[PDB]
């Protein structure tokens, strides 16, 4: 059945490509946060284990919402290790850093998602896709708040 | 008591006129979805009876939110068969279609409401009314997601 | 598949006709109550906004129950503005009356539904349809309690 | 202690006998529904596994209510395979039918309980046992609604 | 405002008089049950303290439903010691009986409410007051189930 | 089994006598508040119906707590119309006053219970019954708060 | 689709045969417990009514778990009176025993289910089926705990 | 740790200064609303006591959300009487007005917060701070809806 | 950090010593109650198993509240078998009494805690430690109520 | 309507003056706690952000309870920045202290509220106002518990 | 601090290595299931969207449980795309298969996890690690049940 | 009534002796954890107070489960200070250690319970008691997980 939501095929494709980068960043941050939840040690273990648990639980919902916006636009949502490694701007950590370095990496991760979201608004200006713009705004709000709570631990 | 929310009376009347069409479309789609919920038959009965129930339940809240935004702008909210029949662009179904035609009609219904919402943004861009713009964006998000789920059944 | 519930087809059709009138009245009262919920003003705004919310919330469930009893009897449930205007004995209000007149109209609405319910019982005795008779009885109970609560506001 | 509820011992015994048949039918349908819940296969597995779960869960409560009405009338409630096999009008299925045949058998099962309930009303009329009449009416309502939901899957 | 629910003023007044006796009996049983809840002793203390608690909790809701049916019929609901002592057929217990006598009096109390309820049906036959008839039937169901549970303790 | 809670039998008997009057006053107020809940009319029906429901719901718990304190002191708790009519200082209303007069009466009821509670404190001075003193204090707190909310309606 | 869970088809059939006897025993105990719940009398009625309710509620869930393990092994789950009478080792009670005898029979029933579970482990040691062994262990744990609670009543 | 969220330091400082004013105005309206909740009297006491409770409860959450957006921007959130008095544009009420004047003041307060929110948008346009824009929009929607509910009481 | 709560160090030390005896008694009663919960047998098993469960569950919270009041006064809370055995006035039961003797011992236990609480008030009066006096009062209320429920089982 | 709660007008005014100082201290501590919740940084951010949230959430309920006790005594509750700055003994912090200094200040704040409550008991002794004394006691309990938890963080 | 749980370090490392493969397989199945949840189309969309959501929700909890068992054994839990691609035996699907192929792949995935779990038991028989064996058994139970539900759709 | 669960009396006694030592160790660790919960201080207070609270809450359930397995085996569950001091291998802490030493002692306590559980398996290998083996396994799983969480704080 044809899709008639006021956005043309090539524009929906370009928006889906941007949201695919956002999905890949968000999913990579999800797994990194889950990883640090398991692997963090030292005197802040209790609070960081819990904090990273809240963060990855929220990111699991965000992954679903971003993916299903791609579906609403008429395209398949990427969902493999290869697709996400190709699209993600977040570099993974293959070892076990000190807790302060875990916090710093997760701050940079929040900012990377924000940076990807910001890269998409120019396209949305040209096209007028208010639902996707609101999604991006919600994600920016969450990552900017989380960035504050994480960097506050360092000071 | 004078209303002083930063929008003049005839500008508020114009936004309320557009929201009245959005309300009438939303309410007509609500009754149609409720109708199909009761009347659908065939092997997809259980899943469509449930899917349509979730949709009309969400629409009943949306009708209330759209109507109370009209009130916040200082105008009466329309609420009769005659008023909605006059304002609605949704085509009503007087008989009992087969399930796949019910699904098709509801997809077109979602897209019709999006179109009505999209028609109001030019006005908000002249007058500046960010709360209504957010309301319209939420309706477009819900209806575009619902159109994906519905049309996915026909693939 | 044949329907063997102990009521013949012609009697099931006659009961469904009566329930179609009850459904149309109930749905018309639902919309009128919802209308007054949005549009009432004056010193009793808070209490009537709330009271009318409770009533239309209940009536939305009642619509579903009546329509699904029609389905159980083997007939399509009506669900359009045209069908309900043809069948309803409640007169819609196209303006915005004063609060006391809103209350008075809703009292009369409760009593109109009771009247339609009473009209159906003679048919049910002849054919013994105990489930439909209990449904009618429940509606009369709800509308007669609601009539008391509304008319108490006038005194 | 004597039982003085406005119904003589012989009439209570006769009503208890009728309810024993209703209980046996309801319990046999309960087990058949539970059986089909485990054993159904094919593309409708997810919907029918869930639908039959809802139905057997409701029937388990109904068995308790019918049995406890027998106890309120002053007689023991039957509760063995031999007693239910002797009293039940529902034939059990010893194999694993196709899903559509499972649906058909459950429709007939609903109608068999309705038929048993109908057969008890004459006694209740001659004797004025309003609580039992209301129990029978509630069972007829549930089974007639369930029959509609089931046979709609076959259209 | 006029009351047009299909029952004449003289008949509504006679039904309200019957419900007043039922209200009085139910409230007197409520207090007696609450009394025994406090004052029962011996090895069955824990079970009877709890069982009587469940019973008086249910009766408090019943008194409200009975009183508000009187109000729906257009008459004030009685609510004083003097009014209830004049209308109640339940004899109060001024001392502290043994647990077994407490149980036996509560059985008789259930049966007294049933008896008062049965006395009202003839009036409802000539008049067609279905909601009141259903209320009476509900009370009869509850009191006959409670009578079975209480007298079972004595066996 | 002897009671050894640090209060001799004569003092326990005197405290119980005082609590017996507090119980009768609390229960009388409970029934009066319940009565006004049913019978109030006029433009304040909705808010007074609800307010009086909250009050009688709280009073029902208070009755149980006061009676059980009497039980803990070693004496039976009174629970009959004749006992409460004898022990109570609260005047019952046998008719249906106007709403403003219902409010006034309930204000005077709250203050009467406070007076009855106040009358018991001297017995506890002598004896050091700290649990009873806390129960009286809580009743005074509730009733003084309720008196403010009620009389605030009259200003 | 072919089943590849690491257990050959005839070995799965043998485990399913053992679980079918366990299912038949558990379901027979379920119906006996339900029967005694309705029919027990005497001074222990309240506590046994409740205790047996808790037991049959647990057993209803265990029946579903056992049946679905048979399904996971690739075989139909038996579910008729004839099948369960054939496969069960627990004998039903066709009359109404005294309460102490009901308790004794339920103790023996718990122990019968333990014995049936035990009888299956030799097969599992040969074949290796750790999920089934864990299910059997859970049923032994529940039935041994329940036997303690039941026989404690008789001491 | 550097803040890299796509908004330079001077722009973040300016937005935080604007939100500091929104925070002060929101907290001042919070305390005024809480004040009127305690201090309102007259026949609308119940409805206004409840209505103003809902409002100050929502405002307390809004205070936290606005302050934490300031934190996300990298600046301290003000939170003292001196700071809020200095930053607020709403004037406090030091006495106890009549209920209609309390309503009027709270309507004006809603509109004053809307004005403070409006004053911040010019700054976000230049900079593109989509999360803050959404926050201002949410506050405008809540205050404009609340203004409608309050001013409806005066009509 | 100095402690400045209006009570000098020596008086706080003396209050903490008294609360240490109350904590020891309460913890010893908690373990005894938990013991009898496991070990009681006979026809009251179900009721005493449940009643003792409610009691020990409440006592667990009380232990925490007493200990933390000691901490608030500035002293370590005792928490070992030797500390509690040294301070406790409750004598432990090393065997398995009959149920009636378990009930009697638990009555005496409630009274032992009350006795210990009464021994502390003189100190509190001389010093005005109102929070500790309220804690003692709440413990006395619970234990005197529990003593009533337990001894009522014996009568 | 006269206030007759057993405390004379001048004494109620004096008690209300003391509670006004308590309210002002509690509200000032509420805002200081809210402030530190937003502004704290360093490795203890997570634990202190959450601890201070729990504290200000509880203080918000306490401010309402203290204010409504003032109302129950017949006096208006103060509720402005100026009224609280005049009455409060807590000095506000206009900057952003180190986390350890925030904790120290919050300890001193709990003790300041305790000191204000203690200053009122002499008056209450002369007048006899048990509800107010119980409220002060509860505040002292909460603040002394909170002081222990806070000062424990320093050790 | 040394780990002394009764298993030597290289034996724990070997168990951790096996569980790392189980974790990688579970996580790969999790993402594949989430992918298919987003991307499935056709008439089974509604039921497969729901079924796959329930599955990936369960798998997300299982990932955490398996990772935290690795942590309990004293080893870091892997958690990157590169590690999971290296350790997994399940192949991802890079395209969008038809619904029946999605079902078949998820059946094969359940069976793949069972094989990986099964492959670890030989090590557990040499070393003895009953907690890990119970985790493996739980995963086998879940995946075998899920395989039945999935393959039933293809029958 | 004889116990027939497939284990001979002296074999059950031996299993119950082992579980009695596990119960004593679990209860000793419970009290030590509760003690440290009250008495810990320093910058980790908030996290350790909460962490130790979660642990002692879980242990309280474990104590009940272990004791009631002893009861299912037909033996009394020990429950006094003297019995637990005799049976326990965990030593109590009579003073107030620094937080890091509290953590270290609780790690050692978790490992002690694991050793006690492990010590019972040789017996169960001779006797066969799968329910007890599963209980031991669950305790080993919980204590090994808790040991990781605790020792992670010391890294
Ligand atoms: Fe965790
Ligand atoms: Fe989803
Ligand atoms: Fe938004
Ligand atoms: Fe204009
Ligand atoms: Fe439905
Ligand atoms: Fe609304
Ligand atoms: Fe939004
Ligand atoms: Fe939006
Ligand atoms: Fe609303
Ligand atoms: Fe429906
Ligand atoms: Fe009914
Ligand atoms: Fe009904
Ligand atoms: Fe299932
Ligand atoms: Fe039952
Ligand atoms: Fe029952
Ligand atoms: Fe009914
Ligand atoms: Fe009670
Ligand atoms: Fe009511
Ligand atoms: Fe009924
Ligand atoms: Fe009913
Ligand atoms: Fe009501
Ligand atoms: Fe009670
Ligand atoms: Fe108190
Ligand atoms: Fe208190
Ligand atoms: Fe084989
Ligand atoms: Fe199932
Ligand atoms: Fe297990
Ligand atoms: Fe096992
Ligand atoms: Fe309030
Ligand atoms: Fe916050
Ligand atoms: Fe928004
Ligand atoms: Fe605690
Ligand atoms: Fe926060
Ligand atoms: Fe309040
Ligand atoms: Fe208190
Ligand atoms: Fe090795
Ligand atoms: Fe979804
Ligand atoms: Fe975790
Ligand atoms: Fe296992
Ligand atoms: Fe397990
Ligand atoms: Fe397992
Ligand atoms: Fe042996
Ligand atoms: Fe605590
Ligand atoms: Fe237990
Ligand atoms: Fe238990
Ligand atoms: Fe296990
Ligand atoms: Fe195991």
Taking residue J147's Cβ as centre, other Cβ atoms within 10 Å add up to 24
Q: How far apart are CA I154 and CA I26, in angstroms?
A: 23
Q: Is B40 exposed, middle or buried (0-12, 13-18, 19+ CB in 10 A)?
A: buried
Q: State the smallest CA–CA distance between residue B59 and chain D in angstroms.
A: 24
Question: Distance from the CA of L75 to the center of ligand 44, in angstroms?
Answer: 15
CB-based contact A93 K76, cutoff 8 Å: no
Q: Which residues surround ligand 44, an ion (CB under 5 A)?
A: L 64
N- to C-terminal Cα separation, chain A: 55
Tokens 């959005």 — which residue? Answer: B22
A34 is in an annotated binding site: no
Tokens 């402690």 — which residue? Answer: I3
Tokens 């002794």 — which residue? Answer: J125
Q: Is J88 left (phi over 0), alpha (psi -120 to 50) or beta?
A: beta
| Cα J37 off chain centre by | 17
Q: Is A106 helix (H, G, I), strand (E, B) or coil?
A: helix
Q: Which long-range contacts (CB under 8 A, 24 or more apart) does F62-67 make?
A: F62/F26, F62/F139, F62/F142, F63/E34, F63/F23, F63/F26, F63/F27, F63/F30, F64/E34, F64/E38, F65/F135, F66/F19, F66/F22, F66/F23, F66/F26, F66/F135, F66/F139, F67/E38, F67/F23
Both structure tokens of F79: 């629970």
CB I125 within 8 A of CB F118: no
CB L27 within 8 A of CB L39: no
> What string of DSSP letters covers F12-44?
HHHHHHHHHHHHHHHHHHHHHHHHHHHH--STT
Q: How far apart are CA F106 and CA H142, in angstroms?
A: 37
Both structure tokens of E117: 């309820």
**According to the 3-state scheme, what is the secondary structure of J62-100?**
HHHHHHHHHHHCCCCCCCCHHHHHHHCCCCCCCCCCCHH
Tell me which residue of F151, F37, F104, F40 sits closest to H45, measured CA to CA: F151
CB K131 within 8 A of CB K16: no
Taking residue L68's Cβ as centre, other Cβ atoms within 10 Å add up to 17
Tell me which residue of F85, G7, C137, K25 sits closest to E92, measured CA to CA: F85
| Cα J101 off chain centre by | 20
Tell me which residue of D126, D23, D114 sits closest to D69, measured CA to CA: D23
Dmax (CA) for chain E in angstroms is: 57
CB G130 within 8 A of CB K140: yes
Q: Provide the resolution (angstroms).
A: 1.9
Query: For I5, which DSSP code?
Result: S
Q: State the smallest CA–CA distance between residue D6 and chain K in angstroms.
A: 52
How many residue contacts between I and J have a Cβ separation below 8 Å? 44
Q: Is G98 left (phi over 0), alpha (psi -120 to 50) or beta?
A: beta
Taken in order J94, J97, J101, J103, the sign of the CA dihedral is positive
Identity of the residue in F153, F154, F155 whose CB atom sits nearest the CB atom of H46 = F153
CB-based contact H147 B71, cutoff 8 Å: no
| Cα F61 off chain centre by | 10
Q: In terms of DSSP H, where are the helices of chain I?
A: 9-39, 45-72, 81-87, 99-118, 121-127, 130-152
| Cα J149 off chain centre by | 17
Task: Check chain E for breaks (C–N over 2.5 Å) and list the residue before each, or none.
Answer: none
Q: How far apart are CA L100 and CA C56, in angstroms?
A: 61
Name every residue in D having a CB less than 8 A away from some CB of B.
44, 47-48, 50-51, 149, 152-153, 155
Kindly list the distances between the CA atom of residue C140 and the CA atoms of C105, C144, E130, in Å, as whole numbers in the listed order.
Answer: 17, 6, 8
Q: Which residues of G touch L6 (CB under 8 A)?
A: 114-115, 118
CB-based contact C68 D134, cutoff 8 Å: no
Both structure tokens of B120: 């109001």
Question: Distance from the CA of F10 to the center of ligand 4, in angstroms?
Answer: 86
CB-based contact H144 B5, cutoff 8 Å: yes
Q: Is D2 helix (H, G, I), strand (E, B) or coil?
A: coil
Is I touching H (3+ C-beta pairs, cut-off 8 A)?
no
Give the 3-state secondary structure percentages of chain D, helix then strand then coil, rounded to 5: 75, 0, 25
Taken in order G114, G116, G118, G121, the sign of the CA dihedral is negative
**According to the 3-state scheme, what is the secondary structure of K117-144?**
HHHHHHHHHHHCCHHHHHHHHHHHHHHH
CB D35 within 8 A of CB G20: no
CB I89 within 8 A of CB I21: yes
> What string of DSSP letters covers L71-96?
HHTTSPPP-SHHHHHHH--SPP--S-
N- to C-terminal Cα separation, chain E: 55
CB-based contact L115 K6, cutoff 8 Å: yes
In sequence order, the 6+-apart residues with CB closer than 8 A to the CB of D125 are: none
> What string of DSSP letters covers A29-63?
HHHHHHHHHHH--STTHHHHHHHHHHHHHHHHHHH
CB-based contact C118 E128, cutoff 8 Å: yes
Tell me which residue of I134, K32, B26 sits closest to F134, measured CA to CA: I134
Q: How far apart are CA F113 and CA C8, in angstroms?
A: 65
Q: How far apart are CA E125 and CA L6, in angstroms?
A: 65
Q: At what angle do helices A45-72 and A99-127 cross, to 10 degrees?
A: 20
Find, in chain D, the residue whose alpha carbon is nearest to that of K152: D41
Name every residue in L having a CB less than 8 A away from some CB of J.
40-43, 45-47, 49
Q: Which residues of A touch L152 (CB under 8 A)?
A: 40-42, 45
L34 is in an annotated binding site: no
Q: How far apart are CA C85 and CA C28, in angstroms?
A: 8
In sequence order, the 6+-apart residues with CB closer than 8 A to the CB of A110 are: A29, A143, A144, A146, A147, A150
Strand extents, DSSP E, C3-153: none
Ligand nearest to the CA of L13: 42
Both structure tokens of K21: 């493969």
How many residue contacts between C and D have a Cβ separation below 8 Å? 44
Q: CA-based angle G134:G138:G144, to the nearest 5?
A: 140
Both structure tokens of J126: 């002369």
CB B62 within 8 A of CB B140: no
> What string of DSSP letters covers C98-119?
-HHHHHHHHHHHHHHHHHHHHH
Query: For F92, which DSSP code?
Result: P
Q: Which residues of B touch H147 (CB under 8 A)?
A: 3, 5, 72
D143 is in an annotated binding site: no
Substitution target from H45, H152, H153 for chain C, most C beta carbons within 10 A: H152
Exposure on the CB side of residue D122, measured as CA atoms within 13 A: 3
Q: Which residues of F touch H42 (CB under 8 A)?
A: 152-153, 155
Exposure on the CB side of residue D141, measured as CA atoms within 13 A: 18
Q: How far apart are CA D146 and CA F116, in angstroms?
A: 59
Question: Distance from the CA of L18 to the center of ligand 44, in angstroms?
Answer: 19
K134 is in an annotated binding site: yes
Tokens 């009351």 — which residue? Answer: E3
Question: Distance from the CA of C12 to the center of ligand 11, in angstroms?
Answer: 21
Both structure tokens of H154: 């005066």
Taken in order G139, G145, G148, G153, the sign of the CA dihedral is negative
Radius of gyration (Cα) for chain H, nearest Å?
A: 17
CB E104 within 8 A of CB E50: no
Both structure tokens of E48: 């009877």
Q: How far apart are CA K74 and CA K76, in angstroms?
A: 7
Ligand nearest to the CA of G135: 27
Q: How far apart are CA I65 and CA L37, in angstroms?
A: 12
Substitution target from A39, A46, A100, A102 for chain L, most L beta carbons within 10 A: A46
Q: Which residues of E touch F1 (CB under 8 A)?
A: none
Radius of gyration (Cα) for chain G, nearest Å?
A: 17
Q: How far apart are CA J144 and CA B139, in angstroms?
A: 51
Q: How far apart are CA C28 and CA H11, in angstroms?
A: 55
Q: Which chains touch B (3 or more CB pairs under 8 A)?
A: A, C, D, H, K
How many residue contacts between A and L have a Cβ separation below 8 Å? 21
Substitution target from B118, B141, B149 for chain A, most A beta carbons within 10 A: B141
CB I76 within 8 A of CB I19: no
Q: How far apart are CA G1 and CA L102, in angstroms?
A: 57
CB-based contact B42 D152, cutoff 8 Å: yes
In sequence order, the 6+-apart residues with CB closer than 8 A to the CB of K59 are: K26, K27, K29, K30, K33
Q: Which residues of J touch F144 (CB under 8 A)?
A: 5, 72-73, 131
Q: Which residues of B48-79 are buried (b: 16+ CB within 10 A; e: fewer)?
A: bbbbbeebbeebbebbbebbbbbbbbbbbbbb
CB G137 within 8 A of CB G118: no
Taken in order L92, L95, L100, L103, the sign of the CA dihedral is positive
F144 is in an annotated binding site: no
CB C92 within 8 A of CB B82: yes
Q: How far apart are CA C131 and CA D138, in angstroms?
A: 7
Name every residue in A having a CB less than 8 A away from some CB of L.
40-43, 45-47, 49
Q: Is G133 helix (H, G, I), strand (E, B) or coil?
A: helix
Tell me which residue of E28, E34, E29 sits closest to E53, measured CA to CA: E34
CB-based contact D3 E134, cutoff 8 Å: no
Q: Is C11 exposed, middle or buried (0-12, 13-18, 19+ CB in 10 A)?
A: middle
CB-based contact K134 L145, cutoff 8 Å: no
Both structure tokens of K2: 């040394």
In sequence order, the 6+-apart residues with CB closer than 8 A to the CB of F53 are: F37
Ligand nearest to the CA of G63: 26
Phi, psi at residue C33, to the nearest 5°?
Answer: -60, -45
Q: Which chains touch E (3 or more CB pairs under 8 A)?
A: C, D, F, G, I
Q: How far apart are CA E154 and CA E144, in angstroms?
A: 16
CB L87 within 8 A of CB L124: no
Q: How far apart are CA J43 and CA A44, in angstroms?
A: 8
Q: State the smallest CA–CA distance between residue G135 and chain K in angstroms.
A: 9
N- to C-terminal Cα separation, chain D: 55
Taking residue H46's Cβ as centre, other Cβ atoms within 10 Å add up to 21
CB J34 within 8 A of CB J148: no
Kindly list the distances between the CA atom of residue C111 and the CA atoms of C33, C60, C121, K116, in Å, as whole numbers in the listed order.
Answer: 14, 18, 16, 69
Both structure tokens of B105: 């009609």
| Cα E128 off chain centre by | 22
Taken in order D81, D84, D87, D93, the sign of the CA dihedral is negative
In sequence order, the 6+-apart residues with CB closer than 8 A to the CB of D37 are: D48, D49, D52, D53, D56
């Amino acid at each position: 059945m044809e899709i008639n939501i006021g956005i043309g095929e090539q524009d929906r494709a370009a928006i889906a490509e941007g949201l695919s980068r956002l999905l890949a960043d968000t999913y990579t941050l999800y797994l990194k946060t889950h990883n640090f939840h398991w692997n963090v040690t030292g005197p802040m273990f209790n609070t960081l284990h819990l904090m990273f648990e809240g963060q990855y639980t929220e990111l699991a919902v965000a992954v679903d919402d971003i993916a299903e916006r791609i579906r609403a636009l008429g395209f398949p949502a990427p969902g493999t290790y290869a697709a996400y490694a190709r699209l993600s701007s977040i570099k993974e950590e293959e070892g076990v850093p000190e807790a302060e370095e875990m916090i710093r990496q997760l701050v940079q991760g929040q900012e990377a998602v924000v940076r990807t979201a910001r890269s998409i608004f120019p396209l949305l200006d040209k096209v007028s896709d208010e639902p996707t713009a609101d999604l991006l705004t919600q994600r920016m709000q969450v990552h900017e708040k989380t960035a504050w709570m994480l960097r506050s631990l360092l000071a």
